[PDB]
Write a protein that binds this ligand. Structure first.
Ligand SMILES: *[C@@H]1O[C@H](CO)[C@@H](O[C@@H]2O[C@H](CO)[C@@H](O[C@@H]3O[C@H](CO[C@H]4O[C@H](CO)[C@@H](O)[C@H](O[C@H]5O[C@H](CO)[C@@H](O)[C@H](O)[C@@H]5O[C@H]5O[C@H](CO)[C@@H](O)[C@H](O)[C@@H]5O)[C@@H]4O)[C@@H](O)[C@H](O[C@H]4O[C@H](CO)[C@@H](O)[C@H](O)[C@@H]4O[C@H]4O[C@H](CO)[C@@H](O)[C@H](O)[C@@H]4O)[C@@H]3O)[C@H](O)[C@H]2NC(C)=O)[C@H](O)[C@H]1NC(C)=O
Ligand SMILES: Cc1nnn(Cc2cc(C(F)(F)F)ccc2OCc2n[nH]c(=O)n2C)n1
Ligand SMILES: Cc1nnn(Cc2cc(C(F)(F)F)ccc2OCc2n[nH]c(=O)n2C)n1
Ligand SMILES: [Ca+2]
Ligand SMILES: [Cl-]
Ligand SMILES: [K+]
Ligand code: NA
Ligand SMILES: [Zn+2]
Length: 805
C-alpha cells in the first residue's frame, strides 16, 4: 500500500528513492505501482513532441511542453536536443568532423569526466558492419573512438545474466542471476521476468557499479528504466541530471534500449523489419550527442555503447522435445528454450534418477540438436556450475534450435523468428563495444574481449576501486588513453626445491619394471648438464610458473622437458616442453611399452607406484611429456620416469594419446614451433578454483595418488609465425584447453570412430583462457617475457574460439 496522494511537483525523476507509504516520483515508481497521482502529468510530458521546429524558436515558455525551444531553456537544462541546431544555426554532432579529444574539455565545477553507458538489448556484433548505412551516429562513435570487432557475452547469453555481469564483473554463477528464470531451493522461491519476486534484493549478489560508486562518494543516475518511459524522455532526464549543481549531479549514468532485441525475437536477426529499430536507436544516440554538445559536454563525457548479447534465427519447427526421448516426462521440470535445465518435479520422489535421464538423452538420434551434461562436466570456459540455482542436469542446445518438454508447451503457451541464450562462443551471440571520450583512445581498434572485463574499466573511468570480480584488471588498459591501472605480478608463495641424485634404485618398491639396463665420458657429462638445466632455455620459454599457494614441490630438469613436481599430489603441477617445426614423432618401442622407471631425485615416499594402477581396474596412466616426442632414443628413457606419470582412465587415454602423437606435431608445423605446458587440474567442488588436498573425492585405488578432474595444456608460439617459437622477438600467440578427465567418451557421439573424427572436436569444445587454468591450478604463467605486463594480461584472457570469420 502507498498513500499516493502526495505530489511530484519539483520532484520529477528525483535521484533518492523515498520509502512507502509516501508516494514516489523517481524513475522506478511505475514498476512498483507507487507513482504519485500527478506523475504522468508533471513528469511524463509529451505536448508538442521531441523536436524544436523553426516556429518554436524563442517561444514563450510553456511548462506543459515535453521539451523547450524558449530562450531560457539552456540555463534551465531542458531544451529539446535539437534546439541549437534549429534555432541557433548549429550543426548536429554527427555532421562535425571528428577531432581527437586529448584532454577532458569540461565546464567549471566538473571534478571528473562523467560516464554514460548506452546499453542496447540484442545488438548483435555484425549489425555494426551490416547496418552501417542506417546508423551514422553509432558509426561515428565507432570509427572515432575505441572499438572491438565484437564483445563476448557470458553464458547463458540471456538479458538479465548479461546486464548484471556488465554491472558487477562477475560470472552469473557468482552474481546469482543464472538465467531469465530460476528456482532457489534454500529460499524455496522462484525468480521470473514477469512479476514481483525479482524485486527482492536476495537474488542479486556481488556489488554492481552504482553501489561501488555510491559507497565511494561518486553519485549515480538510475540504471533501471521503467518500460513505459519512452526513450526520448530517458535521454532528456539524463541531460537534466547533467545540469544539476555540482554537489547533486551524478557522475555515472545509464541509458537502456529494449531494441533491437524486441523486434529480433519477432523477425529474426536480419529480418527486413530490423532496419527501422536500428535507425531509431541511432536517432536516440544522435539525441544524446546533440544534447551533450548543447551542454558543452561532448568532449567531456566518456560514452560506452555496449550490447548484452546478439540474436540467432530460431523457429518453432526447430524444437527438440524431451517427450521424444523420455517416458517419465511428467516426473521432470524443464527450464526450456535455447538452453535446458532439468530437475525433479517433486523432492518427495526418490525414484527420479538423474543418471537414467542423462543416458536417455545421450546420442539417441543421428542429428540430435542438444547435448545433456551434468553441470560439472560443462566446458570450464562457461563457468556455469557453482550455484544452487543451476540444476544438475543441463542441456547445451545447438545454435538455431530450441528444446521443450512436450509439443503442447510450444503451440499452447509460429510467433518467434529470433532467439538467444546459446553457448557464448557462438558468432550470432556476440555483441558490441564502443568507447568514446577523453579517457578512451582515438580511432583505435582493440581485440575482442569478454564482458566480465568492463566493470574494472568503468571503475577506472570513475576513479573507483572495483569490488572483487572475475575481470583481470589491466587486461583492458590498451583501451584507455589515461586512467590505466598499473597491475603487478602476484608474489610467488612457494619456492621450488632442486633435488639432485639422492636415492638408489633398490630403495624403491613401486612394482614398476623397465627394460632399460644397457651400459662414456662424452655422453655421461652430456646427461649431467641436461639434469642441471642446460636445454632449460629451450623448454621453459617464459620463466617457470609461480606457485601462488603454500606447498612442497621440486623442479625436475630433463633433455626434452622441465617439470614442477608436487610432493603433495605425487605428480607434476606443470610440465613444460618445446617442439620445433623440424621435430620428429617416433613410436614407443615394444620393449618400453610398460616401462616406468624410479626417479632417483625423488623419494619412494613421494612417488607414485605401478601396483596401485594394477589393482585399480578402472584407472590406467599416461605421461605429461609425451614419449612420442623424445629428441633421441636415449632421451626417451626420461619420458618413462615415475615423476612424469599421471592417472588416466583408458577412455581418456584415447583423447590424450591422439593429442600427444598427432596434434602437438600438427600445431608445431602450422605455428612454426610450439611451447607446451600441460598438467592436472583438481576441481571436485566445481568452483573454478584449485582444490586443496582435503577436497579430493577420488584416489587411485589403495593409494594416495589423487585423480584429476581435468587435464590442461597451454600452447604458445610467436604471433609473427615467420619466427620460430623458441626465438620470438615480439608478441605471443596462445591456445589452451581444459579437457575433462572422464571414464567414458559419452560426450562425443562419434567416439567409436577413429580419434581423427572426434578428438579435435572435443578439444575445441573445451578451449580455455590461460586465466581459467590459473584459477584452477594456483599457478601464474608468463613470468619472464620481453612483453609488457598489460599485454601479457590480455594474452592470459584470450580465448581461441574455433568459430569461422
Ligand atoms: C569470480 O569472482 C568472485 C568474487 O571475487 C569469486 O567469488 C568469491 O570467492 C571466494 C572463495 O570461494 C568467496 O569467499 C568465501 O566467502 C564466504 C562469505 O561470503 C559472503 O560475503 C561476501 C562478501 O560481501 C559475499 O559476496 C558472498 O555472497 C555470496 O552468497 C550470497 C548468498 O548467500 C549470494 O547473494 C552471492 O551471489 C554470493 O554467492 C556466490 O558465492 C557463494 C560462496 O560464498 C556460493 O555458495 C554461491 O554458489 C555463489 O556462487 C557471501 O554473502 C566465507 O564464509 C568463506 O570462508 C570460508 O572459507 C575459508 C577459506 O579461506 C575458510 O578459512 C573459512 O573457515 C570459511 O569456511 C567456513 O564456511 C564453510 C562453508 O559454510 C565451512 O565448510 C567451514 O567449515 C567454515 O565454517 C569464503 O571466504 C567469496 O564470497 C566469493 N564472492 C562472490 C561474490 O561470489 C569467484 O571465486 C570468482 N570465480 C573464479 C572462477 O575465479
Ligand atoms: C538485469 C539487470 N542487471 N543490472 N541491470 C541494470 C542495468 C545495467 C546496465 C549496465 F550495467 F550494463 F550498465 C544496463 C541496463 C540495466 O538495466 C536496464 C533495465 N531497465 N529496465 C529493465 O528491466 N532493465 C533490464 N539490469
Ligand atoms: C541489483 C539489484 N538489487 N535488487 N534488485 C531488484 C530490482 C530488480 C529490477 C528489475 F527486475 F526490473 F530488473 C528493478 C529494480 C530493482 O531494485 N536489483
Ligand atoms: Ca575447486
Ligand atoms: Cl533462462
Ligand atoms: K588399471
Ligand atoms: Na561416445
Ligand atoms: Zn531477447
Amino acid at each position: 500500500w502507498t498513500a499516493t496522494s502526495g505530489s511530484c511537483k519539483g520532484r520529477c525523476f528525483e535521484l533518492q528513492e523515498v520509502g512507502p507509504p509516501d508516494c514516489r516520483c523517481d524513475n522506478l515508481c511505475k514498476s512498483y505501482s507507487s507513482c504519485c497521482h500527478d506523475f504522468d502529468e508533471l513528469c511524463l510530458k509529451t505536448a508538442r513532441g521531441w523536436e524544436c521546429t523553426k516556429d518554436r524558436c524563442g517561444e514563450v515558455r510553456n511548462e506543459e511542453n515535453a521539451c523547450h525551444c524558449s530562450e531560457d531553456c539552456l540555463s534551465r537544462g531542458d531544451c529539446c536536443t535539437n534546439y541549437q541546431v534549429v534555432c541557433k544555426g548549429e550543426s548536429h554532432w554527427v555532421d562535425d568532423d571528428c577531432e581527437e579529444i586529448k584532454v577532458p574539455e569540461c565546464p567549471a565545477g566538473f571534478v571528473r569526466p562523467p560516464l554514460i553507458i548506452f546499453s542496447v538489448d540484442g545488438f548483435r556484433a555484425s549489425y555494426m558492419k551490416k547496418g552501417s548505412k542506417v546508423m551514422p551516429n553509432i558509426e561515428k562513435l565507432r570509427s572515432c573512438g575505441t572499438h572491438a570487432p565484437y564483445m563476448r557475452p557470458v553464458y547463458p547469453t540471456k538479458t538479465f545474466p548479461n546486464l548484471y555481469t556488465l554491472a558487477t564483473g562477475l560470472y552469473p554463477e557468482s552474481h546469482g542471476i543464472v538465467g531469465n528464470s530460476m528456482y532457489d531451493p534454500v529460499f524455496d522461491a522462484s525468480f521470473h521476468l514477469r512479476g514481483r519476486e525479482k524485486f527482492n534484493h536476495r537474488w542479486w549478489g556481488g556489488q554492481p557499479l552504482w553501489i561501488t560508486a555510491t559507497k565511494q562518494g561518486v553519485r549515480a543516475g538510475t540504471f533501471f528504466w521503467s518500460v513505459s518511459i519512452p526513450h526520448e524522455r530517458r535521454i532528456l532526464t539524463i541531460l537534466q541530471w547533467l545540469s544539476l549543481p555540482d554537489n547533486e549531479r551524478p557522475s555515472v549514468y545509464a541509458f537502456y534500449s529494449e531494441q533491437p532485441d524486441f523486434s529480433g525475437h519477432k523477425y529474426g536477426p536480419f529480418g527486413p523489419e530490423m532496419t527501422n529499430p536500428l535507425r531509431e536507436i541511432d536517432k536516440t544516440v544522435g539525441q544524446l550527442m546533440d544534447g551533450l554538445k548543447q551542454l558543452r559536454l561532448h568532449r567531456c563525457v566518456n560514452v560506452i555503447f555496449v550490447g548484452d548479447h546478439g540474436m540467432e534465427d530460431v523457429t518453432c519447427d526447430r524444437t527438440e522435445f524431451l517427450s521424444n526421448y523420455l517416458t517419465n516426462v511428467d516426473d521432470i521440470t524443464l527450464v526450456p528454450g535455447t538452453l535446458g535445465r532439468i530437475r525433479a518435479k517433486s523432492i518427495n520422489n526418490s525414484k527420479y534418477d538423474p543418471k537414467t535421464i542423462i543416458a536417455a538423452l545421450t546420442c539417441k538420434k543421428p542429428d540430435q540438436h542438444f547435448k545433456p551434461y551434468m553441470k560439472q562436466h560443462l566446458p570450464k570456459r562457461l563457468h556455469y556450475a557453482n550455484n544452487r540455482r543451476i540444476e544438475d542436469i543441463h542441456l547445451l542446445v545447438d545454435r538455431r534450435w530450441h528444446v521443450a518438454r512436450k509439443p503442447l508447451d510450444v503451440y499452447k503457451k509460429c510467433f518467434f523468428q529470433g532467439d538467444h541464450g546459446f553457448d557464448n562462443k557462438v558468432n550470432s551471440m556476440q555483441t558490441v563495444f564502443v568507447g568514446y571520450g577523453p579517457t578512451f583512445k582515438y580511432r583505435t581498434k582493440v581485440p575482442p574481449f569478454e564482458n566480465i572485463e568492463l566493470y574494472n574499466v568503468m571503475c577506472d573511468l570513475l576513479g573507483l576501486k572495483p569490488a572483487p570480480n572475475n575481470g583481470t584488471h589491466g587486461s583492458l588498459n590498451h583501451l584507455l588513453r589515461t586512467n590505466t591501472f598499473r597491475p603487478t605480478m602476484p608474489d610467488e608463495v612457494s619456492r621450488p626445491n632442486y633435488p639432485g641424485i639422492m636415492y638408489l634404485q633398490s630403495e624403491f618398491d613401486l612394482g614398476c619394471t623397465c627394460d632399460d639396463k644397457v651400459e662414456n665420458k662424452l655422453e655421461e657429462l652430456n646427461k649431467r648438464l641436461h639434469t642441471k638445466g642446460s636445454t632449460k632455455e629451450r623448454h621453459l620459454l617464459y620463466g617457470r610458473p609461480a606457485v601462488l599457494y603454500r606447498t612442497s614441490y621440486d623442479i625436475l630438469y630433463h633433455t626434452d622437458f622441465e617439470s614442477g613436481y608436487s610432493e603433495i599430489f605425487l605428480m607434476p603441477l606443470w610440465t613444460s616442453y618445446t617442439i620445433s617445426k623440424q621435430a620428429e614423432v617416433s613410436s614407443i618401442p615394444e620393449h618400453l611399452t610398460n616401462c616406468v622407471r624410479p626417479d632417483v631425485r625423488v623419494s619412494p615416499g613421494f612417488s607414485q607406484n605401478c601396483l596401485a594402477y594394477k589393482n585399480d581396474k578402472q584407472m590406467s596412466y599416461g605421461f605429461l611429456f609425451p614419449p612420442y616426442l623424445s629428441s633421441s632414443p636415449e632421451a626417451k628413457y626420461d619420458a618413462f620416469l615415475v615423476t612424469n606419470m599421471v592417472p588416466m582412465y583408458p577412455a581418456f587415454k584415447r583423447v590424450w594419446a591422439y593429442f600427444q602423437r598427432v596434434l602437438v606435431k600438427k600445431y608445431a608445423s602450422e605455428r612454426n614451433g610450439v611451447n607446451v605446458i600441460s598438467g592436472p587440474i583438481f576441481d571436485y567442488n566445481y568452483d573454478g578454483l584449485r582444490d586443496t588436498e582435503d577436497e579430493i573425492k577420488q584416489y587411485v585405488e589403495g593409494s594416495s595418488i589423487p585423480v584429476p578432474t581435468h587435464y590442461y595444456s597451454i600452447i604458445t608460439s610467436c604471433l609473427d609465425f615467420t619466427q620460430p617459437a623458441d626465438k620470438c622477438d615480439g608478441p605471443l600467440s596462445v591456445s589452451s584447453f581444459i579437457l575433462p578427465h572422464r571414464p567414458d567418451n559419452d560426450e562425443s557421439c562419434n567416439s567409436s570412430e577413429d580419434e581423427s573424427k572426434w578428438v579435435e572436436e572435443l578439444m575445441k569444445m573445451h578451449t580455455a583462457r590461460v586465466r581459467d587454468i590459473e584459477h584452477l591450478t594456483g599457478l601464474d604463467f608468463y613470468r619472464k617475457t620481453s612483453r609488457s605486463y598489460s599485454e601479457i594480461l590480455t594474452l592470459k584472457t584470450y580465448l581461441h574460439t574455433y568459430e569461422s570469420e
